[PDB]
Amino acid sequence: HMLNVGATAPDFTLRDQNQQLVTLRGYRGAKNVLLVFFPLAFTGICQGELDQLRDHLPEFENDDSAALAISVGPPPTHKIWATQSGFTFPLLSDFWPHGAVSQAYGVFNEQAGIANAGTFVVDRSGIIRFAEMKQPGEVRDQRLWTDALAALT
Amino acid sequence: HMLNVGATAPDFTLRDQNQQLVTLRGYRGAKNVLLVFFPLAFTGICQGELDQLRDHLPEFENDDSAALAISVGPPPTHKIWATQSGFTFPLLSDFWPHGAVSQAYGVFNEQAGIANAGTFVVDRSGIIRFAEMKQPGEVRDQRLWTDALAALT
Numbered sequence: 001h002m003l004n005v006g007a008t009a010p011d012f013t014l015r016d017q018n019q020q021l022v023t024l025r026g027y028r029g030a031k032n033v034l035l036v037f038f039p040l041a042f043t044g045i046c047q048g049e050l051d052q053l054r055d056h057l058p059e060f061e062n063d064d065s066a067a068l069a070i071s072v073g074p075p076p077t078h079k080i081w082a083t084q085s086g087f088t089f090p091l092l093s094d095f096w097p098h099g100a101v102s103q104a105y106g107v108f109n110e111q112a113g114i115a116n117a118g119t120f121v122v123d124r125s126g127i128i129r130f131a132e133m134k135q136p137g138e139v140r141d142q143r144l145w146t147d148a149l150a151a152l153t
Numbered sequence: 154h155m156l157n158v159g160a161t162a163p164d165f166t167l168r169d170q171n172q173q174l175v176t177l178r179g180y181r182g183a184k185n186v187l188l189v190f191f192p193l194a195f196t197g198i199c200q201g202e203l204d205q206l207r208d209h210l211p212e213f214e215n216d217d218s219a220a221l222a223i224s225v226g227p228p229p230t231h232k233i234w235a236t237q238s239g240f241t242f243p244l245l246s247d248f249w250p251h252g253a254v255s256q257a258y259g260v261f262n263e264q265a266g267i268a269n270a271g272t273f274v275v276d277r278s279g280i281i282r283f284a285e286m287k288q289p290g291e292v293r294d295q296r297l298w299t300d301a302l303a304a305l306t
Contacts, residue, residue, distance in 0.1 A: 042229035074267075076195040077230050096266025098251040113249030114227075 002106045002118055002131050009035075009122040010104035014070070014092035017078040022090055024122065027066055032129075032152045033122040034060050034067040034145055037107045039114040041073050041081040041091075045139070049117070052142050054087055059146040061089055064153045068092055072099050072114055107133070121148045155259040155271060157284045162188070162275040163257035167223070167245035170231040175243050177275065180219055185282075185305045186275040187213050187220040187298060190260045192267040194226045194234040194244075202270065202287075205295050207240055212299050214242060217306055221245055224268055225252050260286060274301045 003010075013023045027033045036053065038046040050069060053060060060067035070092045071078070078091035094101040099115060102108035107118035117134030130148040134140045156162070166176045180186045189206060191199040203222060206213065213220040223245045224231075231244035247254040252268060255261035260271030270287030283301035287293050 040227055040229055042233050073230070074193055074226075076193050077226065080195045080233075096251075098249075098266065113251065 002133055003104075003120070003128055005128055005131055007128050009033075009120065009126050009128050010101070011126075012101045012104070014094060014101060015075050016090040016092055017075050017082045017087075019075055020090075022068065022092055024068075025126065027122075027124075028126050029124055031064060031066045032124060032149055034065060034149060035105070035120040035122065036067065036069045037102060037105065037115040037118045037120075038069060038071050039109075039112075039117060041071060041077050045117075046071075047085065049139055049142075050085065050087060052139070053089065054085065056142060056146065057089060060149065065149045070094055070101060070115065072102065119145060121145070121152070123152055155269075155284060155286050156257075156273070156281055158281050160281045162186075162273065162279055162281050163254070164279075165245075165247075165254045165257070167247060167254065168228050169243040169245055170228050170235050170240075172228055173243075175221065175245055177221075178279070180275075180277075181279050182277055184216075185218045185277060185302050187218065187302065188258070188271075188273040188275065189220065189222045190255055190258065190268040190271040190273075191222060191224045192262070192265075192270065194224060194230050198270075199224070200238065202293060203238065203240060205293070206242065207238065209295060209299070210242060213302070218302050223247050223254060225255070225266065272298060274298065274305070276305050 067089045074093050074095045099108045102115035107116045119132045121130035123129045164178050220242050227248045252261045255268035260269045274283035276282045
């Protein structure tokens with residue numbers, strides 16, 4: 001089960017698609033952070049969700065907000081996928097330990113070994129202010145993410 | 154340590170790039186099996202290795218032998234990579250549990266969470282007849298594999 005609103009966002013340091021280290025706490029005091037967990041690269045549903053994030057990127061990656069996509073895939077996988085899909089935002093690798101970050105946020109699927117489609121908004125204080133789990137047969141509403149971020153400014 | 158010649162090749166059941174199950178024991182009493190463990194899809198080092206396999210595929214995949222590539226990546230990853238590289242042989246997913254099959258063959262890298270570049274030849278009885286792990290920094294000479302399979306007829 002997902003970490004609830006008001007809980008302290010577990011810290012993490014993960015490799016992005018270009019092998020750079022990205023730390024959640026690096027955004028404390030500066031930007032609200034949108035964490036988009038997704039199951040697998042090269043799958044239709046994740047493609048659609050990240051394509052929509054790509055299309056509305058300025059509403060998520062700006063002076064007040066940062067957007068980080070997270071999955072169990074390693075950087076080379078995310079690099080190729082990001083290049084083909086045109087993703088310029090960071091795709092982080094919760095690869096080894098496998099899904100450690102996903103488990104900390106309570107969005108890890110132990111049966112399949114992938115992250116569930118959970119989204120969080122972490123405020124400037126490192127506190128989770130928004131938490132949304134994707135429901136069966138549907139895509140997450142991203143207007144809801146922009147509004148949640150806009151509300152924290 | 155890596156499993157060496159004389160040992161029983163641990164049995165496995167894994168999904169190939171097209172989600173079809175592939176078991177090692179299915180080849181016993183029929184074909185010699187080349188097991189090629191590789192670290193990560195979309196990396197130059199693994200590309201070079203599997204390209205060499207692809208370029209000489211008829212010598213490994215015939216009436217007397219089959220070739221299986223294995224790594225920790227999931228099927229969608231291998232599917233896309235196989236399509237881009239023109240790989241027609243099975244790329245199996247040692248994805249969940251993470252690196253289980255690789256750990257059973259003693260070719261799993263615990264620091265990086267990937268399989269080391271290990272190659273095995275399993276004969277019709279299920280015994281390892283060839284076992285070689287890539288000297289990281291040096292490239293695998295695949296004519297040594299063909300000779301290993303040549304001696305099993």
